[PDB]
Amino acid sequence: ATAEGIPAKGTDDGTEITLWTRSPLERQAKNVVEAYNKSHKNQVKLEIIPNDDMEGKVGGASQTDSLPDILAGDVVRIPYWASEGIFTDITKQIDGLDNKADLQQGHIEAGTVDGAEYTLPFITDVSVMVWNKNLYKEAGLDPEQGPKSIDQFVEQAKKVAALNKDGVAGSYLAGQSGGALVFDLFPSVWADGESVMNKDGSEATLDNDSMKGVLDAYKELANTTNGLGAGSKEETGATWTAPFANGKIGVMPYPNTSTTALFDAEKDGGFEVGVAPIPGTKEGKTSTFLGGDAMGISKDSKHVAQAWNFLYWLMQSDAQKEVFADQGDTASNIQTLKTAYKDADPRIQTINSVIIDGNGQTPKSPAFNEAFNAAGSPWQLLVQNAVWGSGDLKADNKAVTDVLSAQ
Numbered sequence: 165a166t167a168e169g170i171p172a173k174g175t176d177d178g179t180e181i182t183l184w185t186r187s188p189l190e191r192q193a194k195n196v197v198e199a200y201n202k203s204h205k206n207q208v209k210l211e212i213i214p215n216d217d218m219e220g221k222v223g224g225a226s227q228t229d230s231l232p233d234i235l236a237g238d239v240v241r242i243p244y245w246a247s248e249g250i251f252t253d254i255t256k257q258i259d260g261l262d263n264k265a266d267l268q269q270g271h272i273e274a275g276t277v278d279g280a281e282y283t284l285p286f287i288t289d290v291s292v293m294v295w296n297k298n299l300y301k302e303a304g305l306d307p308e309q310g311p312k313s314i315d316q317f318v319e320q321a322k323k324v325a326a327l328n329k330d331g332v333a334g335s336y337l338a339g340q341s342g343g344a345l346v347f348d349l350f351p352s353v354w355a356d357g358e359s360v361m362n363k364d365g366s367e368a369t370l371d372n373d374s375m376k377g378v379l380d381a382y383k384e385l386a387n388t389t390n391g392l393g394a395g396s397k398e399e400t401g402a403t404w405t406a407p408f409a410n411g412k413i414g415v416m417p418y419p420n421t422s423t424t425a426l427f428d429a430e431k432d433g434g435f436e437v438g439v440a441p442i443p444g445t446k447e448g449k450t451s452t453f454l455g456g457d458a459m460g461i462s463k464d465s466k467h468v469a470q471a472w473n474f475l476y477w478l479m480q481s482d483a484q485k486e487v488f489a490d491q492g493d494t495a496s497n498i499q500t501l502k503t504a505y506k507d508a509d510p511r512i513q514t515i516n517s518v519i520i521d522g523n524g525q526t527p528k529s530p531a532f533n534e535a536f537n538a539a540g541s542p543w544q545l546l547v548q549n550a551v552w553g554s555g556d557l558k559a560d561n562k563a564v565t566d567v568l569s570a571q
């Protein structure tokens with residue numbers, strides 16, 4: 165596949181375009197594809213793939229040259245895929261977008277290799293703090309006030325735990341999901357101005373005061389009756405958003421892409437949701453994980469101009485407004501974030517503020533899956549030791565480094 169000679173806006177000619185993305189982003193992906201298909205001759209044939217299957221599916225399809233036209237991937241997985249030639253070089257096409265500066269830059273950076281560009285943002289997924297205002301009220305907490313520090317997060321989680329009720333816990337930790345753990349825990353380190361990787365992405369820097377404070381917090385909750393919801397230790401990632409949605413959890417980090425479901429449940433007469441940025445150990449410091457899926461045109465596409473038509477279309481602020489803002493979801497285009505949510509739910513305005521304010525990060529390493537997301541990764545073992553066992557954070561950190569720096 166090559167993007168040589170394709171039109172600046174791509175080709176809309178009735179081609180069937182295959183697109184892969186992952187189950188956690190299903191609500192947003194269906195909205196995007198339906199909007200494109202209702203307005204173009206080209207038609208996107210969408211496949212939603214379970215989060216933990218996407219590596220095996222991409223690796224196998226790459227070997228049989230059966231990758232889809234458009235492959236969306238978790239921004240932490242993209243650098244590896246881009247480095248191994250999974251994507252068609254679309255530098256010219258990306259650099260030709262008149263609004264490139266407006267697009268979520270972490271998604272473009274994820275697919276950059278020595279300045280060659282392979283990806284654009286597909287769906288932004290940021291981590292935020294959610295809490296159950298009904299549990300807060302019952303526990304004697306001010307339901308309007310989310311946690312401004314990790315210490316206040318522990319204090320609020322402990323007050324809800326002390327309700328001492330079957331099925332109610334202060335917080336929840338995705339104990340065996342390295343990907344949910346980086347998403348939920350990294351922002352508290354960045355909030356404090358600390359780093360999780362070194363200057364050149366080849367070493368972990370998790371042996372720092374902020375990360376220790378975060379792990380201290382979750383250990384305290386692990387040692388509190390009803391501190392962490394049943395299933396925390398065994399949570400694979402397949403159910404980690406369920407206990408909060410089911411009203412069983414006081415307060416935890418959570419995906420913005422899962423918040424529209426909560427806001428719908430509240431409209432139906434369910435429990436009221438609070439949303440705020442994830443805090444540092446340092447009070448009033450905040451950040452987020454600028455995650456979700458980026459997308460590019462696979463090396464196997466026979467329809468590069470037609471796939472580019474989809475990428476081009478979605479980058480436009482009007483498209484972003486239709487498929488994200490108008491649906492209550494966070495856009496990938498800062499112009500859309502600043503203009504399309506003026507009478508939106510203030511919690512959505514809160515979510516957007518964390519992106520507009522610029523203090524979140526997208527981590528980039530070609531070894532990110534092996535070091536972090538993978539089942540039994542050195543990062544998962546680091547967290548499991550610190551929260552539920554004993555650990556040597558210097559040793560456990562160096563075990564992450566040894567995977568990031570492997571040649």
Ligand SMILES: OC[C@@H]1O[C@H](O[C@@H]2[C@@H](O)[C@H](CO)O[C@H]2O)[C@H](O)[C@H]1O
Pocket residue numbers: 188215238239240289341342343344346347401402419454455456457537
């Ligand atoms: O994977 C890193 C980052 O976290 C969010 O994805 C989560 C995924 O890892 C877990 C396991 O399913 O559930 C998702 O919430 C985000 O989309 C991604 O960039």
